[PDB]
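Please predict the structure of the following assembly.
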Amino acid sequence: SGFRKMAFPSGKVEGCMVQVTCGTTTLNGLWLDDVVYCPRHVICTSEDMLNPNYEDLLIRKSNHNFLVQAGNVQLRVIGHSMQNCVLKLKVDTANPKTPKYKFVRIQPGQTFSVLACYNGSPSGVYQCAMRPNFTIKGSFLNGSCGSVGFNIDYDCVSFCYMHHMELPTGVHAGTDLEGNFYGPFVDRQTAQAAGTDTTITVNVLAWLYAAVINGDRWFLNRFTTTLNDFNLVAMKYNYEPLTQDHVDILGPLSAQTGIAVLDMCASLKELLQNGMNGRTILGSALLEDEFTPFDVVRQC
Amino acid sequence: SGFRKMAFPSGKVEGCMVQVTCGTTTLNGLWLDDVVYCPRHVICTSEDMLNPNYEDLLIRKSNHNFLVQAGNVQLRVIGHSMQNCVLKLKVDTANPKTPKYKFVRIQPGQTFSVLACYNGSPSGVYQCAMRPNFTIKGSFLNGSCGSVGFNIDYDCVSFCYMHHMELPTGVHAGTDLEGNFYGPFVDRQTAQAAGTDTTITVNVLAWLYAAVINGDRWFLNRFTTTLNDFNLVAMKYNYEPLTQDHVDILGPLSAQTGIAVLDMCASLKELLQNGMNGRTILGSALLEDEFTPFDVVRQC
């Protein structure tokens, strides 16, 4: 038993991490088949970042201006193109370590594993959730841009996130692997507002289910509530609204734990209205929301 | 920036995870060169676990009683031996994916990454700390025994933990890779007392340094204290004592943050005596102790 924030094993993505250098700027890229994907602002100097015109800047770049290194081995760039906010570098060799993969755009509230990298070599891995305001609370120093996020289904890596920037507020922003940013953000150094970071309610409920399964039960009450009554209280406390879809998703936890979802919803209300009073659930003094119901089920 | 609980990339250990079956019992083993390491209680039935005599039980086992599978490929067992609480299975092929490795016994308070596995296939990875009472608070379902813990230094995997059991209290226990258990525990199904789980003080201080570096500063006071005066308060709150060794280790964080260790010690006193009052540090309502000062430095 036990319950841990767990990332997917990173070996399959590790074999895709390379170093991309363009001028004085080095970030990471994703080498899948014969294409390297990296943040387009690899072509930016620090002063370009204030207001870059990527098409004008990219015209000044040639294939030979792009140094791509996979470990110590140098790939020959034979094409370059801009997919929205991502550069696609055609290289001369297909990655023999290309895993089976797909590119996916995940929804707010979904979780993924990040392989944080520097100079194309993997440094660490951790599990993160896509905030409702389309930011992530990651750990990214200079040079980590282009590190990717992914989920794994059996033998397939689903790439869902590539990192591009830290907003002046300290939160992190990026794109899917076709380069469309999550949220209204762009790869330019300007003040950029992140939304109210509301709480992912469905994830909180799943974690309570995880807690009940792991024997933390003190927060169970015998109350119930309705879905609309609960959601009225949820908004005041900056929680995302709960939908029937979410109730549907929690069914297996509802069925496995013998605790009806609306009973579980009622317990959360009491935690919201009364705080935890310094008690803990699964070793945390806060309601945890970076576990999806799938995360809980997989681990359980 | 940002600060996350981060595990080491798991790819190098992933390539070592195999399935070991003995009778009706299946756990994981570590295939390094031509030796597979696994928990010796793979040879136990459920009823043996109550009071196993491993030498008498192992005499009844032959090399052919041990099925070892690396993915779909079957290894030929050509020798078996018991290193304390670990079985060493000599197999007929050296793992071509054996990374550079060493076996190390870590100290209480040190952290490591766990690659949780089932049927020899990696499931997830998370960062854990060795509790002062030589347990870990992991996430281990049935079949995860033999999953290993490790740190990485450049290209070398330091194996420090192999999982053997969950104590009736829900915490987890295991061995170094020569099979000597951490703590007074044995691989038998009996009530086994874990110690008072005291808090790893040096780790708490490092995380505060991580917090100050990441801009969480509200907990800084302008007080100082002495080392003995601080430790008097620490014991009452079930914190491990702070040594000069630990002060020495925190030097770089003290030097990087401009906050003297004893000033940082004084701040912790105030958090201990006053609680956090519902405020947060690095998004946590509790003092976090599963980051060593090295963990902080690496990430920073």
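Helices of chain A lie at 11-14, 54-59, 201-213, 227-236, 244-249, 251-257, 261-274, 293-299. The two ends of chain A are 8 Å apart (CA to CA).
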